Design a protein around this ligand. Sequence first.
Ligand SMILES: CC(=O)N[C@H]1[C@H](O[C@@H]2[C@@H](O)[C@H](O)O[C@H](CO)[C@@H]2O)O[C@H](CO)[C@@H](O[C@@H]2O[C@H](CO[C@]3(C(=O)O)C[C@H](O)[C@@H](NC(C)=O)[C@H]([C@H](O)[C@H](O)CO)O3)[C@H](O)[C@H](O)[C@H]2O)[C@@H]1O
Ligand SMILES: CC(=O)N[C@H]1[C@H](O[C@@H]2[C@@H](O)[C@H](O)O[C@H](CO)[C@@H]2O)O[C@H](CO)[C@@H](O[C@@H]2O[C@H](CO[C@]3(C(=O)O)C[C@H](O)[C@@H](NC(C)=O)[C@H]([C@H](O)[C@H](O)CO)O3)[C@H](O)[C@H](O)[C@H]2O)[C@@H]1O
Ligand SMILES: *[C@@H]1O[C@H](CO)[C@@H](O[C@@H]2O[C@H](CO)[C@@H](O[C@@H]3O[C@H](CO)[C@@H](O)[C@H](O)[C@@H]3O)[C@H](O)[C@H]2NC(C)=O)[C@H](O)[C@H]1NC(C)=O
Ligand SMILES: *[C@@H]1O[C@H](CO)[C@@H](O[C@@H]2O[C@H](CO)[C@@H](O[C@@H]3O[C@H](CO)[C@@H](O)[C@H](O)[C@@H]3O)[C@H](O)[C@H]2NC(C)=O)[C@H](O)[C@H]1NC(C)=O
Ligand SMILES: *[C@@H]1O[C@H](CO)[C@@H](O[C@@H]2O[C@H](CO)[C@@H](O[C@@H]3O[C@H](CO)[C@@H](O)[C@H](O)[C@@H]3O)[C@H](O)[C@H]2NC(C)=O)[C@H](O)[C@H]1NC(C)=O
Ligand SMILES: *[C@@H]1O[C@H](CO)[C@@H](O[C@@H]2O[C@H](CO)[C@@H](O)[C@H](O)[C@H]2NC(C)=O)[C@H](O)[C@H]1NC(C)=O
Ligand SMILES: *[C@@H]1O[C@H](CO)[C@@H](O)[C@H](O)[C@H]1NC(C)=O
Ligand SMILES: *[C@@H]1O[C@H](CO)[C@@H](O)[C@H](O)[C@H]1NC(C)=O
Ligand SMILES: *[C@@H]1O[C@H](CO)[C@@H](O)[C@H](O)[C@H]1NC(C)=O
Ligand SMILES: *[C@@H]1O[C@H](CO)[C@@H](O)[C@H](O)[C@H]1NC(C)=O
Ligand SMILES: *[C@@H]1O[C@H](CO)[C@@H](O)[C@H](O)[C@H]1NC(C)=O
Lengths: 322, 324, 323, 174, 176, 174
Amino acid sequence: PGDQICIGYHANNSTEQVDTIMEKNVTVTHAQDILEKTHNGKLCDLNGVKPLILKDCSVAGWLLGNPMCDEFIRVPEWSYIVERANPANDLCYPGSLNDYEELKHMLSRINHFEKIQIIPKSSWPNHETSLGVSAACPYQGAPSFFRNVVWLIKKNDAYPTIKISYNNTNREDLLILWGIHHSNNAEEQTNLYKNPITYISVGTSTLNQRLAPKIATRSQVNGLRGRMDFFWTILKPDDAIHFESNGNFIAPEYAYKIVKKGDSTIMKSGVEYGHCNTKCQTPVGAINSSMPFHNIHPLTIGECPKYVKSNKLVLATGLRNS
Amino acid sequence: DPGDQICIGYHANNSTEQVDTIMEKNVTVTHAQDILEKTHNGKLCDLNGVKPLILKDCSVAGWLLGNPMCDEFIRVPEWSYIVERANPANDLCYPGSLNDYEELKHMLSRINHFEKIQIIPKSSWPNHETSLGVSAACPYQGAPSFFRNVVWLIKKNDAYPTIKISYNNTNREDLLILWGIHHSNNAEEQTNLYKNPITYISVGTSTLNQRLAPKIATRSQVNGLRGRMDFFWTILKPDDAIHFESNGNFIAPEYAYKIVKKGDSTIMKSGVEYGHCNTKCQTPVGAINSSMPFHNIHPLTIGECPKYVKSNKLVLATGLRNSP
Amino acid sequence: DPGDQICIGYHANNSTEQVDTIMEKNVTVTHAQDILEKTHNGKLCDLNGVKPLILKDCSVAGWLLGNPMCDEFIRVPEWSYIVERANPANDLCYPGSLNDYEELKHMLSRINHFEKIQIIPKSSWPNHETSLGVSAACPYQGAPSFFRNVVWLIKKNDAYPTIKISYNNTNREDLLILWGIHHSNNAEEQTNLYKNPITYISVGTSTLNQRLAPKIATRSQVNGLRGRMDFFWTILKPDDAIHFESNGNFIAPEYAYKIVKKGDSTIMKSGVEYGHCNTKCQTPVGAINSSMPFHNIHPLTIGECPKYVKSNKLVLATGLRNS
Amino acid sequence: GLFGAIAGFIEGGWQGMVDGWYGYHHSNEQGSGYAADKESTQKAIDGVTNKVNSIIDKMNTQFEAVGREFNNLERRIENLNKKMEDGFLDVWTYNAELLVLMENERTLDFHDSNVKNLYDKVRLQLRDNAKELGNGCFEFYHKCDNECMESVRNGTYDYPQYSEEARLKREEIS
Amino acid sequence: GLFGAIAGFIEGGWQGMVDGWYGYHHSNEQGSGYAADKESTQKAIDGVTNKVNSIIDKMNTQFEAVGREFNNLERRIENLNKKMEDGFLDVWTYNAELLVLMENERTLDFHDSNVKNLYDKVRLQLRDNAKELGNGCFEFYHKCDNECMESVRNGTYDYPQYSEEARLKREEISSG
Amino acid sequence: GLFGAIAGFIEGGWQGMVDGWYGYHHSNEQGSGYAADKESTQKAIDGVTNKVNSIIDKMNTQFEAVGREFNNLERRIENLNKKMEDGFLDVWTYNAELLVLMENERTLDFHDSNVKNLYDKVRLQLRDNAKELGNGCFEFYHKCDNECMESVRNGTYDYPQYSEEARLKREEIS
Ligand SMILES: CC(=O)N[C@H]1[C@H](O[C@@H]2[C@@H](O)[C@H](O)O[C@H](CO)[C@@H]2O)O[C@H](CO)[C@@H](O[C@@H]2O[C@H](CO[C@]3(C(=O)O)C[C@H](O)[C@@H](NC(C)=O)[C@H]([C@H](O)[C@H](O)CO)O3)[C@H](O)[C@H](O)[C@H]2O)[C@@H]1O
Ligand SMILES: CC(=O)N[C@H]1[C@H](O[C@@H]2[C@@H](O)[C@H](O)O[C@H](CO)[C@@H]2O)O[C@H](CO)[C@@H](O[C@@H]2O[C@H](CO[C@]3(C(=O)O)C[C@H](O)[C@@H](NC(C)=O)[C@H]([C@H](O)[C@H](O)CO)O3)[C@H](O)[C@H](O)[C@H]2O)[C@@H]1O
Ligand SMILES: *[C@@H]1O[C@H](CO)[C@@H](O[C@@H]2O[C@H](CO)[C@@H](O[C@@H]3O[C@H](CO)[C@@H](O)[C@H](O)[C@@H]3O)[C@H](O)[C@H]2NC(C)=O)[C@H](O)[C@H]1NC(C)=O
Ligand SMILES: *[C@@H]1O[C@H](CO)[C@@H](O[C@@H]2O[C@H](CO)[C@@H](O[C@@H]3O[C@H](CO)[C@@H](O)[C@H](O)[C@@H]3O)[C@H](O)[C@H]2NC(C)=O)[C@H](O)[C@H]1NC(C)=O
Ligand SMILES: *[C@@H]1O[C@H](CO)[C@@H](O[C@@H]2O[C@H](CO)[C@@H](O[C@@H]3O[C@H](CO)[C@@H](O)[C@H](O)[C@@H]3O)[C@H](O)[C@H]2NC(C)=O)[C@H](O)[C@H]1NC(C)=O
Ligand SMILES: *[C@@H]1O[C@H](CO)[C@@H](O[C@@H]2O[C@H](CO)[C@@H](O)[C@H](O)[C@H]2NC(C)=O)[C@H](O)[C@H]1NC(C)=O
Ligand SMILES: *[C@@H]1O[C@H](CO)[C@@H](O)[C@H](O)[C@H]1NC(C)=O
Ligand SMILES: *[C@@H]1O[C@H](CO)[C@@H](O)[C@H](O)[C@H]1NC(C)=O
Ligand SMILES: *[C@@H]1O[C@H](CO)[C@@H](O)[C@H](O)[C@H]1NC(C)=O
Ligand SMILES: *[C@@H]1O[C@H](CO)[C@@H](O)[C@H](O)[C@H]1NC(C)=O
Ligand SMILES: *[C@@H]1O[C@H](CO)[C@@H](O)[C@H](O)[C@H]1NC(C)=O
């Protein structure tokens, strides 16, 4: 006998196993895993724009010019902000920044950013401009203060009522920051500003703010019972901001031109910068796209796969192996 | 010799309809159905038989306070949603703000019954002037005016006696009451208007307990005005009383709104013209029919709508594979 | 011709259970299995071994401040979730408000350790009246009373000296401290109670810097009262001191709570009785013990629960067509 | 397809079959023509109708009011709504596409299954009394009148009626 | 009915057989009885068990506290929570209902192929020694006893052992 | 197992077949060897490639910035975000796992149907000129040389050429 023709199918030496709905651990000739599990372990540029990396400073310290942070650098643009989980450098003088979370969200991605001086120290001929200094903000071990703002003190035992204004002649939005100092007692209030009852008036086309110091006993933070509450606003072009105060005024000196075109968030990571580019950034590293799913980290920025709780997603492509 | 022949076969027609399967693309089929909604009528329609409130030239704040530059339309006792332009032409003729504006807008998005009534007529102010609270930034009928549902009280005969008034909600429905405070520009302006250098406003109900003081300072010019007026609101429940106390800078109510709210909606930002139509699903660019499980018109829909997807076609094969 | 016959066939039985396919409806099958959980025990249970904090008819505010109609001292030092009724009857006997009330309730939803301690004894006010701060709106057994955990300080001998008191958190645990301010009705009432026409409250910690002032104005009667009491709270972390300054209208704290929080939960609105049971998933109408992927009991669930769906049955065919 | 029929042993399908989805074509001494099998097409009509209705009707829709009611100092909350909206868009777009892709594969296989099953019913009735050309047709070993043509189509083909005459055409014809 | 066995040519289950989901029914001179194929039945029961377990075990459940913690001036936030909760209910409801509908179709067709696979197994062995009745049974052209029945039910039917014996009747049966 | 080919009447795969997924093994007077059916192998490759690409390309991805920007007095808001992120994770994890399980079952049966269809195409051509061995092989009743074997794999097998030889062989065993 003989002359036989047979029908059969391919088989190889593969050990790749896939799971089906009715059967588990089915060895197949070929298979592909559609789950991304690999990251480069480096913080990268997001679509060609480098992140703004704050080494040890929070956004509040970097914005207000904490003497332990650098005095601005070549950062005219960034795609996201990298913060440490607990930045050591923050508001050195204890206090607060109003709407700090909303301010950070706006500053997460900035198209254009440039510090300028809006009010020189020559604009205060009747107040002391160099005496606004504290030991809780030392620069070279010597007491100092926030670089971008001025702590005004009485001159000649007098604090004349301030009436100053700035017209935003720039063609871009301006970010202006100012503060109010909270005294500890009545005696300290007069020693610094000579005026017992004081106020701060801030006015723009949209802003109408009145601030008064809260003089009370408070626990020591960084050796200080005093507090300073800082505030911010966005001054539109050709608009003007008006400051009026008779004490406790932390007058702005520098301001930032803001051009915002997109949005991002704040990333909390200690991973270093790798001079790379990516479409998706996770706190532990960047991941290359084209897989529909991933399991690296939930707190991603960019066009990323869908984060799942799987360790393997293996699609079967070949035949069942013998 | 002729072997009789019986054959099996299937249907075919003249159809160019194409579907995509999981393993083949562009498969011609005899018949198919699309389960995706793609058409809108390009109009704003009534939602379940209730026409929306369409503020063509006004914001909600300006409409409520009675901005004289906003067009007056016939009273609308009920609406299913509120339509606003992206940038309303008139919002606040006198520069200022309305407190909790976003929440007030959301509450007023769907109102079962709305009716303006008079609570404090201008005849009820013997010791304060009621007709000079007027600005050129709020013209009405060729004359300087103000928000017409409130009254801007001014000193009379160089005197502003302290106001102590009360209103009891005798109606069976809730009442929306608005009032405000005027922020002066300097001490001279304050005395020229109210004669009292230091002024306050106290408002009290069974729940409300509010104290205001004018923030007298220098600001930028809006509509040619450096002053500001911040308005506030509350819902006066039936049989409760509201108590106003002030010695200056008080923007007293004159009209209030009997309000009945049963359902909830939002505010649609659109400029599409009203279409005198009814729908179960409204988009800012038009109404859709909402029979299919999916649609790709717009994400900001009001009503009972299909699931919004970013797709161009969802075509199901119903017939067989068609061959040429 | 009795040709021997071998046949091929399949099972059948008496089952009337029916499943639906994507192309056919009402198909009887020999075996079927439902993946929709539909049963609950109808009682409020412990959540993973921890009993819920059930407030019968008191709110979180009245329970915290010490409303006389509430429990004077709760036994639970630990709870998994708080059970409130839809409208608690005893919220604030004296009309007023509690600052950041909704966020405070979220924190207290699940508490690892909770113990009330006394931080300021009533003997700490030698020149103020500590026994006249009562009200008909806060009765205990008919007689006028007040919140048990705070002291309504009143002028003594027609004088209200400026108060300057402070407390250091010497404990090893965070302290929840509550205080308040009383809003007078008129100038004469302010004098009749505190003798100082213009008064203030200053509260200061390492993070808190608060200035309060009474709002003396005409208001509507609530519980027969036109006065109001606004209450506030803060978390005094260990080794930090709170500082109080006031010359009138001060509602001083007496008792505080040592609090340790290690998990999060929410407030459940229910009237269902406690069932002396344990569960990993709890609903306002009853706890469910299931491993099914879906349930249709209730949407407002606390715990590890299946996915709530709008379905009456999800029955899968685990057998063949019946006949 | 998945069973073999549409573009299988049958190549293109019949344009003259306008009375149904599946059917027969006979060719005897009396003439030729087309006919449809009512039971098979009706099941196919109901099956696809149920499939489309199930996909449409099983969707649950609720009233919602979707807008933008957060101000410039509530952008963090508006980001949360954006993430929620876009997340649901991704879920529904993905499911709708795959559901359409997969059920279309099922539907065409379902039509393929019906044609092959209709073939096997004819195949198991004619047996050795007819010979299969392998292209979707059968060659009778006897004479089949229009009455007997319906018998194949309507399930009443009597095997002994032509078994003897068949042998005189298959075995006898060498 | 995707493979045409369950209700295509078999046309009816057997209430008599209680041993398994699929099996055989022999009827010879010794008697009549029901046999169940333990091989395919065990595979089907194990296969359906995996499907049901996979539908159940793949659902990830985490601790969540669902409540209503927003007040009369936080309704916009509440609307966001409502849209989120309603959105997740719509997703799960659609998936769960359609998952059952699709898998119920596959499970029934899974049972349909198992019968045909058993049917095609017997058909190959007998070839011409037994005719195809069309009702899911094979009437042997030869004589087959209980031992011979076992060979068909475990895959050891010797065709040439009864070849010419079938032919003598086959060439005579068709003669009428 | 749905078609009883890959694990059924064909009990195993061929390691010697390396140029395709499905194919033929022949054994005639000129020798024995392997031949892969590229018409079936290419269509299977395109379909499997389309399925993997569809599972990948139909996913819609958008720019999102996922962080934690809510303070200690906004924990209700961040709990809303927690329920949103966890809910979407449950949706995607359940979808992804079941999508793999269902399609892996579908893909394996897709190969099963292709192998079965190859067997039926060869069987439909040989008819009674070959013997069905029930193991995936056909024993010819005639002499099928290398050119004849290619015709079977080319769908061009000529039945009338070997009819009398096959019938003589069938009678030769009688
Ligand atoms: C300006 C200054 O050094 N003031 C200290 C004060 O001296 C007073 C003197 O300025 C005035 O003319 O006359 C009165 C008597 O009538 C005082 O003699 O003396 C206090 C008690 O010795 C000091 O308090 C101490 O302050 C410490 C912090 O020092 C700094 C700081 O580093 O933050 C010193 C800075 O020069 C000063 N800033 C400015 C702009 O003048 C600040 C400032 O006073 C506070 O930050 C405001 O709250 O304080 C420690 O806090 C220490 O515990 C405390 O005893 C006065 O510093
Ligand atoms: C302290 C007191 O008894 N006040 C009531 C007032 O008595 C006057 C007295 O205070 C003053 O020294 O001398 C004059 C005569 O020269 C009066 O004898 O009389 C008013 C008129 O009836 C009362 O108004 C009523 O107050 C009610 C409130 O009851 C309580 C409460 O809510 O528990 C009673 C408490 O004794 C009282 N506590 C304190 C520390 O003063 C509080 C408190 O006054 C208010 O809660 C503050 O707003 O009030 C009802 O409100 C009732 O409707 C009202 O007519 C004075 O209470
Ligand atoms: C929702 O479905 C309805 C019903 O199918 C659609 O309404 C239909 O719209 C078409 C085109 O606008 C109308 O056709 C027109 O009819 C008039 C006669 O009335 C004729 O003069 C025109 O030339 C044209 O054929 C049709 O009448 C109308 N049907 C009904 C019942 O009113 C509607 O357009 C769908 N909605 C959307 C958003 O697509
Ligand atoms: C499959 O079997 C179910 C029973 O399990 C059938 O459901 C029944 O369908 C009838 C007619 O559609 C329903 O009557 C209708 O009920 C509603 C209220 O639910 C009423 O508004 C209508 O006027 C009418 O009386 C009946 O209630 C329903 N029963 C149940 C238990 O759901 C179903 O029709 C069967 N489907 C098919 C395709 O055969
Ligand atoms: C299924 O096919 C069979 C064929 O084997 C059909 O039996 C035949 O049915 C036709 C239809 O009525 C009968 O023809 C009729 O005959 C009488 C008398 O000659 C005449 O008056 C009528 O006008 C018509 O021509 C035919 O006799 C009958 N064959 C018999 C009785 O042997 C059967 O009806 C078919 N089933 C269905 C449901 O159509
Ligand atoms: C299915 O057909 C569509 C046309 O309906 C094809 O889409 C075309 O793709 C080419 C690619 O180069 C474009 O240049 C054409 O403009 C497209 N036409 C349209 C109308 O969109 C599509 O490519 C086809 N599918 C495949 C797999 O080839
Ligand atoms: C499948 O294989 C993996 C890897 O070896 C093993 O961990 C797992 O237990 C296996 N599962 C079963 C059901 O055999
Ligand atoms: C700023 O300067 C421009 C220059 O024309 C002027 O028009 C504008 O009013 C100024 N802004 C003020 C005064 O707020
Ligand atoms: C309003 O009038 C009713 C009429 O009986 C009265 O009972 C109620 O107390 C009044 N509300 C006040 C005074 O707030
Ligand atoms: C509380 O007492 C401790 C004891 O060492 C001290 O360190 C701490 O500063 C005190 N807290 C204050 C003063 O706020
Ligand atoms: C298939 O093989 C036959 C026999 O060798 C040959 O004649 C025919 O041309 C082939 N078909 C092709 C090459 O398309």
